[PDB]
Symmetry: C3
Subunit: 493 residues, 3 copies
């Protein structure tokens, strides 16, 4: 009776392909009678609300549990008291005594001392959530954060109005964990679990202790580490019999670097491959590269499980080119904008839909206006229904520079939509068959990409034939049966 634990720093709604990956892998293992659950190492007051959201959308399976370090201690504390922390509420109440109130917006109000004139507090009410900012010498010193009129967290601020210390309160209002935050970089330093009256060097120390308490040291206990930052938390555990795996979801080479350097985190995972049960990469291509560059052997290729949903009823006849991604520098949407310009200047009709949000969103938006493509290129924002958006596209495009495998492309192919993409490390090459199910463009060759988009976007028969062969190819190469078989081989060694 095996039981899996998938480590990631945090879970959220706007999240990329790594979380999509974990959720699908969780579903697939639960279907194989192995409970795969997620472990997180961050504080979030509204975690319950988030899980409810992720499960409603169908993104997260209902079966999958989410174990969290703070919640484990909040639980310990909840059960230690019976009466409410009335004292803390009186403490906050007392601070706002002889006060006059000045209104700003709706929820927003500032409180001044009736007798002295001193600025006392700032309160921002928002239905469920409320925030109280207390002041000393006209500078903010603390912030009491509430959810459903109950205090959950307290942050202390420095002279630069930056957090330097946090306190977390249980369901009864009692402090269970408090921790120093480095104001400069925002790094979590000394953690103090108040409930068990024990101190920790930092989150790594705390989470190692957590994992050692959460996971049984059985050979039937499996730790999978998806988050690269989370790796040392798994690596440093005293677990002698428990299985330890590390999954590398990205190109291990340092992004935008010609010096032949590697990503710091990934390098550490790769170097220590032999000291654990195995390091997993998505493409056989990346496996070879890693083996040829490093003196390790424990590297295995296991692709992502593919959710083979049913393909749309009809193909999109209208000239619509799609792109569903995290809006980041490596996805090179700037080059997609430059390709779009070449396309529209040869054919006015074609429309480009760019779903997603991120860092580069504003620069690309500004880039659209200057190039005068406001009527041709639209930033449709983050979707929660990618499958639905895919119906509306004639073809999908990828300007992405670096990739681990590229699920967005796989997803498009599954929903009978051909992909036009730059042949990069790693993934496009693996699933795309140039002039059969899609186009594999030479990396950075924006002019040739633009031409092969015009070719496909005007020929409705090709767009239909390519999209069909694309779905066929994914079902073939990425069979859920064969992928699970690869995992199970590792688990039984």
């Amino acid at each position: 009776m095996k039981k899996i634990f998938m480590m990631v720093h945090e879970l959220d709604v706007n999240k990329g392909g790594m979380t999509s990956s974990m959720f699908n892998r969780s579903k697939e293992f639960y279907d194989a009678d192995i409970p795969a659950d997620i472990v997180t190492f961050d504080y979030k007051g509204n975690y319950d609300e988030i899980i409810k959201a992720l499960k409603k959308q169908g993104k997260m399976d209902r079966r999958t549990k989410m174990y969290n370090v703070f919640e484990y201690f909040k639980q310990i504390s909840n059960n230690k008291h019976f009466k409410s922390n009335k004292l803390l509420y009186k403490h906050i109440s007392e601070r706002l005594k002889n006060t006059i109130e000045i209104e700003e917006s709706k929820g927003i109000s500032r409180y001044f001392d009736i007798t002295t004139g001193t600025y006392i507090a700032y309160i921002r009410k928002s239905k469920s959530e409320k925030v109280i900012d207390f002041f000393k010498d006209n500078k903010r010193i603390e912030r009491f954060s509430f959810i459903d009129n109950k205090v959950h967290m307290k942050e202390t601020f420095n002279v630069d109005n930056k957090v330097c210390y946090q306190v977390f309160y249980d369901e009864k209002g009692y402090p269970y964990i408090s921790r120093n935050i480095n104001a400069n970089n925002g790094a979590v330093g000394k953690t103090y679990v108040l409930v068990n009256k024990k101190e920790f060097k930092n989150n790594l120390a705390l989470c190692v202790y957590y994992l050692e308490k959460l996971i049984k040291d059985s050979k039937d206990s499996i730790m999978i580490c998806d988050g690269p930052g989370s790796f040392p938390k798994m690596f440093n555990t005293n677990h002698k019999n428990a299985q330890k795996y590390g999954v590398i979801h990205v190109n291990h080479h340092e992004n935008f670097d010609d010096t032949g350097a590697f990503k710091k985190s990934e390098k550490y995972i790769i170097e220590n491959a032999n000291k654990i049960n195995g390091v997993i990469v998505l493409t056989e291509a990346q496996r070879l590269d890693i083996l040829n560059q490093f003196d390790v052997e424990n590297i295995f290729t296991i692709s992502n499980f593919v959710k083979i949903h049913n393909a749309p009823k009809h193909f999109q006849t209208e000239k619509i080119v799609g792109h569903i991604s995290r809006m980041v520098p490596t996805k090179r949407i700037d080059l997609l904008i430059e390709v779009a310009e070449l396309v529209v200047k040869k054919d006015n009709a074609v429309k480009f839909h760019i779903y997603g949000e991120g860092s580069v969103k504003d620069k690309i938006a500004k880039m659209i206006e200057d190039k005068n493509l406001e009527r041709n290129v639209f930033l449709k924002g983050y979707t929660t229904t990618p499958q639905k958006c895919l119906e509306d596209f004639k073809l999908v495009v990828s300007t992405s520079q670096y990739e681990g495998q590229g699920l967005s492309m796989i997803e498009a192919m599954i929903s009978k939509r051909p992909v036009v993409a730059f042949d990069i490390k790693y993934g496009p090459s693996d699933f795309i068959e140039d002039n059969k199910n899609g186009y594999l463009i030479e990396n950075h060759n924006i002019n040739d990409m633009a031409d092969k988009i015009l070719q496909l976007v005007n020929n409705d028969v090709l767009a239909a034939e390519f999209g069909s062969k694309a779905r066929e190819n994914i079902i073939e190469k990425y069979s859920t049966e064969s992928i699970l078989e690869k995992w199970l081989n590792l688990f039984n060694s």
Copy 2:
């Protein structure tokens, strides 16, 4: 029934020609049955004391009222309470409890905690005024400022011992206004009028609201803006029928600049000339310059009203050269010192009297010592009786670089004293007739100025003849009747 409101940031005793200008214009309009009053936008605890002073000296007419934004709210607050703010005094009292006192000077005493040794407060008593500086962690945190044993203001200090917040107390000790001060530049940010429980973006916001409440939106209501910084406070009012005028009291070109740049504030006043009832300049010369440089028409020349006092009984026979001015860089007293040196080296007898105070005072004082003119050039300090000092001079001199009109020169001419001055923008050219009532020296030609001073300071008949024709010329050109006529034309349009 017209009523005028003259806007200036503040009123004080040491003040220059702009305040002298406003007071005289106030007297002149009151004599024309139009009440002209002054509006100020700054906090001063002792304002009443200052007005009493200005009215005693005869500088300010007894009829003229001074409306002030803070006093308007202090008034509102005064009337809101009946009992004294005994609580605030107990708050200050309590802070100095188990304290020992150490003496420094007379009024000066420091207070230490008897039980702990902590530095508690610094108190400086001075007959009517008292200041209490409170400390936290051996650093000053607040200053309670008192007048006649009653607290009027409280300042909060940062880590750099700079004011970052102010609170103002009424006649009963209750806080009415509190405001954030930018510690770096000393700029007034968020103003909170505690009495009316309303917040304002800053002093501009607060004063716009004030003016809208103070001034009736009648066509018989007139706003004159003398202070260039005060301009936006007048400009931004919702007043649809009230008349809006801007007076430019200085050379609109940027001081000490060869790039052809303009004074920031003046540029804004000038540019928006057409959007208001009119922008007023003192010289017809400046009017032309402004019209030839900017695309506006609403520029009018109205000189200052001249107080034609009676001229002294006798002329000064003794070799005494005078100068009455704000001691600033534009008045170029450094060049006067260099001229004085040329004069004394040709004639030992001549004495130079330099009344006034300001920025450059110390540098000029140091400059006198090094040039060895300690026995010939004397810095007589600020006078409150310029008319009296003028009796003692044979002639008056002006090294001033930039000028709006130059009243000090006009004043000298009225009191039968010829003026030797650099022909500059703007004013000397207008009233001085070279070799008739004075000398108009080529700007910066210190050698020729020195020569024309020696000429006049040795010839007692010329100094007498010039001074006589000078008084005649001012009575002629600057008739109070004609000036008031110009104003009244604008008001009735």
Copy 3:
């Protein structure tokens, strides 16, 4: 009936030759029926413990008293109260109320608020001593320092966690002195003697007042200033009849300087020589140099009194080279390490013993490892029995660059151990007779020093003959009778 007062900033255990010098001079004067006592100007909680230590070791004579500025005021305060400062202890007690404790090491524990989670205090217990660090907004604000469960000092900290203010408590727990400390340089600013409710500009001001109160203005009262920094404290006293002497214990030229510059402090002592009773130097050599460089006459040569202890029973036959010094840059142990390398490369047998501690200790330790002399050169750490260590050496060496006289060398010679040293300013030249009782090596000539060490360390007869003539020479030149005679001549003038 003469009475002497020897000024030095502080007394401690690890201390160099200046304190050794003062103690011996104290013993010698007490033997001459003149009580010579030490005056100190620093705060130390454990001073009594230190004196007990110095007197047990026999370093300090039992007769010699140590007058201290803080102790004088602590005494004043002790006698002002009868009941204990129970209030202060309640104040500290109250601060640690609703607190939970977290353990770090043994003594080390941190305290958190049970109701709020705020970090309250840090306590480090150590048998007699205890330190309590209080916090505000997760930053340290104060430190209560205790000895035998009684609070003696309180330090206040800034935002940079640096001391900016100190408070000292008497034997009853009452504050007697409080003072501002410049956080940047650690300089003592405004001193407030709380007991006498009087303020002082700084320690200089306070100590001048102290000395004026401690020392009677009699011609039979003598002030000797050994500490160069302490000089102004003696110089600024209103004493009209009391005798004032300044002793210069070092080379007056600025260390590591080719510009011909002088030590700032020493320069001031030397320049003001004529304004006091006399400036004392140790070598007749330095006297001449000072007289030839400065326009003063009041410079006198008086050597240190030499403690002529009995020489060891037998000479060291084994190849052991010794060095007893403060480990500082001027002692140039880096060159001794370079000499040791030359010696060991010619003779493997020889061992080097380097007693003492200081600045350069770590660099020299690192230097030993790299040169591969870990088996030949050993850093034996600070000794409290130099006489005992001297028995174990065949010869002693000096690489010292700058010196006043160099007692460590004299000490070695007294205990029949020849000295191999660089001929420098000042001292080696005076007592060493090259090729008679030791070797005088040309300064920096490491190769020749190494050769003359090998010569002496292999010839057991020479090492014996030199060491014998060395003891003879010190007894001869540095007779306690003649030295005391020089002092007494100054005192009776």
